[PDB]
Design a protein around this ligand. Structure first.
Ligand SMILES: O=c1[nH]cnc2c1ncn2[C@@H]1O[C@H](COP(=O)(O)O)[C@@H](O)[C@H]1O
Ligand SMILES: O=c1[nH]cnc2c1ncn2[C@@H]1O[C@H](CO)[C@@H](O)[C@H]1O
Ligand SMILES: [Mg+2]
Ligand SMILES: [Mg+2]
Length: 419
């Protein structure tokens, strides 16, 4: 299941949906009073959950006859909440926009609750701003694919997310692009983020010191770059930081022998899969220094170049096989890794985005590291397995679970607008 917590919330809402909304599906009239009654019922449930989250935050920071928070007993796979969530307020806002309580035949959905949770997380940080002594946002990180641009895409100059990233940098907020795309070379990132770095360079609104608060953490936690601008020349872009300056102690402790054996085992497994699944020859296995993956290809013939893709069932088969085999392999158990299905491909990366975000939290301010409660990672891959390379970011900070580049822009708009 994609998220036990969201599915749990969805199931709770089903009872008042059936009893107070479906019971009126054949109504001739009185549409509004029914809507307001449904709305109150849902709101009450979100208010209750809001209270369970506060209760869990208190439990988690102090440390029940069963040795767990109430909400953990209710939802065993639940992650950590680094901030409270104004769920009732967020429900009421989303209901006004989406008219959830006005439905009579379609229950509150997974995506409804996903939206409500994102809006609650945004609302929490908007509140901190208006607060004296506010626990304000200090780090916003983004996945690339599906989050900043279409899958496999680049950030072109007319991309509407760019003004919002510049506004984050302008407000003093640190911005990291934490992406599985893993290049030991600034040039490739400069091409894929070209529109963003040109707009940032062109900006006269932003001090250079703040422009340089833009970073890339590539390969999830393998390659760190920082935006630079030395006016001596018309030169700007990204410069790589040596890993000795930013690798976390736990990562420094890993054996490079275990790193290598992990990638070798994954590569061998991908080759085995490619033969067993009789994949088209145009499909490629790509081995990198800190990753290995399998990707689509292309062929001629129409008189037309056409993509050569893996089926959905093959991608699922491959990512499950990699994940399960590596969880049973001693060298990969001694380090960390992330396997994911990106939609059209499957990769195994050394490390993971929890390590990438945590690395940035310290890198940006070694003397007073950015806290999880001050961090927001935005991405699309939040399933626990499969479409999953953002999932571990929940270990390092708050998250926003988006579904498209358009959602990312909508949420940054609401985060940053004046209300
Ligand atoms: O090292 C890696 N680890 C995991 N995913 C990668 C890596 N390199 C590239 N990707 C992703 O794989 C796809 C193909 O990469 P591209 O051809 O370099 O753009 C894109 O979705 C990339 O973002
Ligand atoms: O199991 C979980 N599912 C969804 N969100 C979670 C979970 N655990 C912790 N959070 C956090 O709740 C906020 C709103 O979704 C986000 O910060 C998310 O990371
Ligand atoms: Mg993505
Ligand atoms: Mg590549």
């Amino acid at each position: 299941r994609k998220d036990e917590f969201i599915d749990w919330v969805k199931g709770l809402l089903a009872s008042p949906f059936v009893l107070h909304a479906v019971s009126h599906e054949g109504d001739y009239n009185d549409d509004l009073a029914t809507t307001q009654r449904v709305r109150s019922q849902y709101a009450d449930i979100f208010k209750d959950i809001e209270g369970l989250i506060k209760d869990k935050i208190e439990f988690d920071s102090r440390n029940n006859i069963l040795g767990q928070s109430r909400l953990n007993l209710l939802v065993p796979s639940i992650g950590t909440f680094f901030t409270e969530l104004p769920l009732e307020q967020a429900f009421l806002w989303e209901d006004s926009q989406r008219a959830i309580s006005a439905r009579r035949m379609v229950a509150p959905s997974f995506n409804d609750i996903r939206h409500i949770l994102n809006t609650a997380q945004i609302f929490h940080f908007k509140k901190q701003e208006n607060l004296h002594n506010g626990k304000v946002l200090r780090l916003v990180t983004f996945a690339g694919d599906v989050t900043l641009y279409e899958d496999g895409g680049s950030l072109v100059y007319t991309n509407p997310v760019i003004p919002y990233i510049l506004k984050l940098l302008r407000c003093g907020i640190n911005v990291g692009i934490v992406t599985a795309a893993g290049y030991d070379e600034a040039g490739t990132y400069e091409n894929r983020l070209k529109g963003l770095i040109v707009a940032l360079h062109d900006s006269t609104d932003i001090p250079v010191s703040q422009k340089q608060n833009l970073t890339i953490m590539g390969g999830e936690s393998s390659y760190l770059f920082r935006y630079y601008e030395d006016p001596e020349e018309d030169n700007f872009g990204f410069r790589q930081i040596d890993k000795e300056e930013w690798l976390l102690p736990r990562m420094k402790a890993w054996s490079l022998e275990d790193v290598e054996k992990t990638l070798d085992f994954a590569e061998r497994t991908l080759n085995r899969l490619r033969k067993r699944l009789n994949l088209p020859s145009e499909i490629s296995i790509i081995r990198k220094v800190r990753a290995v993956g399998i990707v689509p290809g292309e062929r001629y013939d129409s008189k037309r170049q056409v993509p050569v893709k893996l089926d959905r069932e093959q991608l699922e088969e491959i990512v499950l096989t990699l994940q399960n085999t590596l969880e049973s392999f001693a060298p990969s158990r001694r380090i960390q890794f992330s396997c994911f299905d990106g939609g059209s491909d499957v990769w195994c990366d050394i490390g993971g985005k929890d390590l990438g975000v945590r690395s940035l939290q310290q890198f940006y301010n070694p003397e007073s590291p950015i806290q999880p409660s001050e961090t927001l990672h935005v991405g699309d891959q939040f399933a626990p397995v499969g479409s999953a390379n953002d999932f571990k970011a929940r270990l390092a900070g708050c998250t926003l679970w988006i579904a498209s580049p358009q959602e990312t822009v909508n949420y940054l708009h609401r985060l940053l607008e004046t209300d």
